[PDB]
Amino acid sequence: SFKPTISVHATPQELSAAGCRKIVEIIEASGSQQWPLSIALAGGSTPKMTYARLHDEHLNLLREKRALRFFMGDERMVPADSTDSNYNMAREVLLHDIPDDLVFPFDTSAVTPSAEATSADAMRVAEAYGKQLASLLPLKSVGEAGPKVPVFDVVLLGLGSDGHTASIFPGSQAEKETDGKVVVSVGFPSETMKPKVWRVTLSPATIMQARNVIVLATGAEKKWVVDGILADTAHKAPVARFLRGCEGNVSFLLDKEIAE
Numbered sequence: 206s207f208k209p210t211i212s213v214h215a216t217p218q219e220l221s222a223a224g225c226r227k228i229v230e231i232i233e234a235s236g237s238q239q240w241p242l243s244i245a246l247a248g249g250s251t252p253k254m255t256y257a258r259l260h261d262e263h264l265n266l267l268r269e270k271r272a273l274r275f276f277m278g279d280e281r282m283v284p285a286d287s288t289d290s291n292y293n294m295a296r297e298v299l300l301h302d303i304p305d306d307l308v309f310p311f312d313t314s315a316v317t318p319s320a321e322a323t324s325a326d327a328m329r330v331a332e333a334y335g336k337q338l339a340s341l342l343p344l345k346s347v348g349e350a351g352p353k354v355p356v357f358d359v360v361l362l363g364l365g366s367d368g369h370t371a372s373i374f375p376g377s378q379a380e381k382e383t384d385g386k387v388v389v390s391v392g393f394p395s396e397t398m399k400p401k402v403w404r405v406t407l408s409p410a411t412i413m414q415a416r417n418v419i420v421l422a423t424g425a426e427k428k429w430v431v432d433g434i435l436a437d438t439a440h441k442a443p444v445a446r447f448l449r450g451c452e453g454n455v456s457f458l459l460d461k462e463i464a465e
């Protein structure tokens with residue numbers, strides 16, 4: 206059934222060290238002929254620290270050595286220089302140093318600060334990204350018969366207290382996109398989550414085809430979420446329970462609390 210790897214870390218500087226260690230280890234295990242490996246980045250302070258660690262400790266591996274091709278697993282429909290942009294964050298801590306031919310943020314260039322984006326806009330950005338992905342990454346039939354989705358080597362994920370991952374929110378349509386017909390979907394945050402802006406996100410089908418999925422999550426308030434992914438039988442399941450269906454390697458980098 207479901208056996209992900211789980212490791213617990215007392216501090217942020219410890220989990221960030223393991224997150225970055227885990228990526229490097231996947232990078233080395235793959236060897237240079239496989240590079241660049243594709244990785245879908247997540248937003249949030251935990252990954253942020255992991256990025257800064259790669260920036261400080263393995264720039265050479267990524268720049269001179271071109272180990273990874275960076276993508277965004279989910280994004281806020283705001284301008285790229287907005288502080289609410291996942292890319293903005295990623296770029297501030299790491300990507301301003303990564304070759305441009307190895308960085309692929311979402312195209313939010315039509316999003317201005319005068320008019321909030323709608324689902325119409327998010328859908329446009331998603332379709333376009335889906336196209337780039339199919340052109341850049343390997344495609345794989347879903348269920349050996351089904352439609353074609355791109356295969357990432359690595360997807361970094363976060364988890365919210367509403368049990369969502371990436372920008373795939375409870376009750377959402379994105380959440381239902383598991384058959385492969387939709388590679389990048391759309392979604393609006395639930396009540397307890399901010400910023401209140403439309404999102405684009407890798408669908409669950411795309412994520413379940415990734416070769417490695419690494420979830421970093423802290424907080425006692427997110428424990429129900431992990432508990433709910435790991436349970437034998439689904440009961441009042443969080444959205445993230447779909448991760449159970451991941452075809453590749455799943456790992457949880459957890460703090461002491463969310464673990465307990």
Ligand SMILES: O=C(O)[C@H](O)[C@@H](O)[C@H](O)[C@H](O)COP(=O)(O)O
Binds near residue numbers: 252364394
């Ligand atoms: O390390 C963090 O800060 C979390 O991983 C963080 O991302 C949060 O708990 C939710 O993910 C809400 O952000 P969203 O509403 O955009 O998903």
Ligand SMILES: [Zn+2]
Binds near residue numbers: 260299
């Ligand atoms: Zn730098």
